[PDB]
Amino acid sequence: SPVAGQKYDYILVGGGTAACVLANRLSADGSKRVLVLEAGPDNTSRDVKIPAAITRLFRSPLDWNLFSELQEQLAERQIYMARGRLLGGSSATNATLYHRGAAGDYDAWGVEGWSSEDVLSWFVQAETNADFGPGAYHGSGGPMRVENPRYTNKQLHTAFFKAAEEVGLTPNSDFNDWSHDHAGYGTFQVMQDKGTRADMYRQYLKPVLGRRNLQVLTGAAVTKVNIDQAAGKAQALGVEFSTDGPTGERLSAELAPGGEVIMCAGAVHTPFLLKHSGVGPSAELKEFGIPVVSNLAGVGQNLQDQPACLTAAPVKEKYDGIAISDHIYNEKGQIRKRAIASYLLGGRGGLTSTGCDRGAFVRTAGQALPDLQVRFVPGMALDPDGVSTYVRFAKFQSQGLKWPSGITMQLIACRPQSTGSVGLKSADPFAPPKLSPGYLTDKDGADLATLRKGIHWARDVARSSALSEYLDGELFPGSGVVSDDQIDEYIRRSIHSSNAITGTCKMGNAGDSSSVVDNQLRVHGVEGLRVVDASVVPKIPGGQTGAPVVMIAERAAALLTGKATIGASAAAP
């Protein structure tokens, strides 16, 4: 109806992080008709713009409200896995931390044309940094805004840094500088523009919405890719969607000749939509009567997510009032005047903060790269599940109660060995996917050992004189949790997502039978169909996954518009 009579050079499934970048670069020269289909609404919420409002976005109408299958290995629990549902996608709901990981993460992919040397210029092209000038590892004119966080806890941030030095960890002045080792303590940069969320809707899509060759539909739920098995190969025709929920008319958007469908529905929904389109393991598609168009074992396999647990500790009575919770709320749960004024006057203070933007990468046992990320928060968790405690914090407003002053250290397995999957529970494309994070399932128990040693690392730091000054005991996991078996059980009962999720449409070399896309991001066995989102990441880098997604989308845009090739090798003689 809004597409009837139209032919598109690109149809982007989803309007999230990658889709905003592609919509921008693919529509730039004016010759190509680009359509964006996003299930969620327009990006207008004040809770998106204010970083501390991340607390309100969890479990909100701007989230998918996805829950895993029951996890036997995690005390028989379903795990909440937050996912953005609006233009900008998860970039509009994330903790804004800016991480590329280490050079070793990209070289470990072992995919021709996607080495660390290959991807570095695509990170740099995307970047404008308020705190790092141009050089080997930083750019200065790209659409992303990156900056040092504009909130500092004067007592607790320096106490965390002094405590990390007292236990012998070295500082890392730039977690994105590949000329030195990834390990150390320091400050995480953030995807913010003077304390306002700089999501990819704001940085890439919103500025170009006036382009006549660019059509963006919201409230548009894609139900499948339309694929024709005519000539002698499967050919994408376009995509089916509803603008009116499960009961809506199935509309079809149509490709112009030479048109491509680009999957941008992210590491949960892209493999889900591919399976609904006939692209996936034939046995899974046959289960729900889906005709097999491309029998691809890898679709929805290799789900990688970075699992988290935490410690938390109150400050002494004499240090009541010094936590970020005291800077945001007064003793009655009223938003502080000073915080509102500092945010609105010059984009500073507690409302600029996502909480978890100082920390460390740590090797728990002589690994080639750090297995542990630490996120220090100068406020005290009231739940061992950090995401639950952020939801509690949002609901705390105006309750007339005092949030107790303290600290938290979240421990993340940042290069996990466990994998999970995404598949189908039902034939209905409006139904939640069958979601299995796979936390703590690796054969050697490596991921559990990382989180157990992380808790020992956080306890060592909290015991150090620098942080001991402020603290008065431990709330989580608490004095009942001491032996390795007690810690392991605390972890199983409290483990939560640090909200990565990659690898479900794994990019791979020729000869890699687990791959879903080639090094050109084309889906095996279909013409005019690509995946450009976190799905394609072969092996998850250390640290949060947003910046790698934007890099992949920048490089894919350059490839599709003929400004770059991928691979590399001279022809053999």
Ligand SMILES: Cc1cc2nc3c(=O)[nH]c(=O)nc-3n(C[C@H](O)[C@H](O)[C@H](O)COP(=O)(O)OP(=O)(O)OC[C@H]3O[C@@H](n4cnc5c(N)ncnc54)[C@H](O)[C@@H]3O)c2cc1C
């Ligand atoms: C709570 C949270 C915290 C995070 N913290 C950080 C962090 O601090 N730093 C960071 O770098 N990364 C962070 N991440 C991860 C990062 O945000 C993601 O890896 C990245 O945004 C993924 O980009 P994407 O384009 O692959 O998918 P997304 O941005 O998730 O976009 C996919 C889009 O597809 C849409 N879609 C789904 N199904 C359909 C359908 N049927 N029809 C149409 N559209 C559909 C979705 O609604 C969504 O808008 C966080 C993630 C979350 C959720």
Ligand SMILES: CCCCCCCCCCCCCCCCCC(=O)O
């Ligand atoms: C943890 C609780 C998060 C609280 C966040 C909401 C705080 C709102 C303060 C009052 C509104 C501030 C003025 C509106 C600013 C709009 C956002 C922006 O345009 O950058």
Ligand SMILES: CCCCCCCCCCCCCCCCC
């Ligand atoms: C955005 C600032 C909110 C202040 C929160 C005060 C409590 C601190 C809790 C930290 C929770 C564990 C680690 C972070 C979880 C990230 C979702």
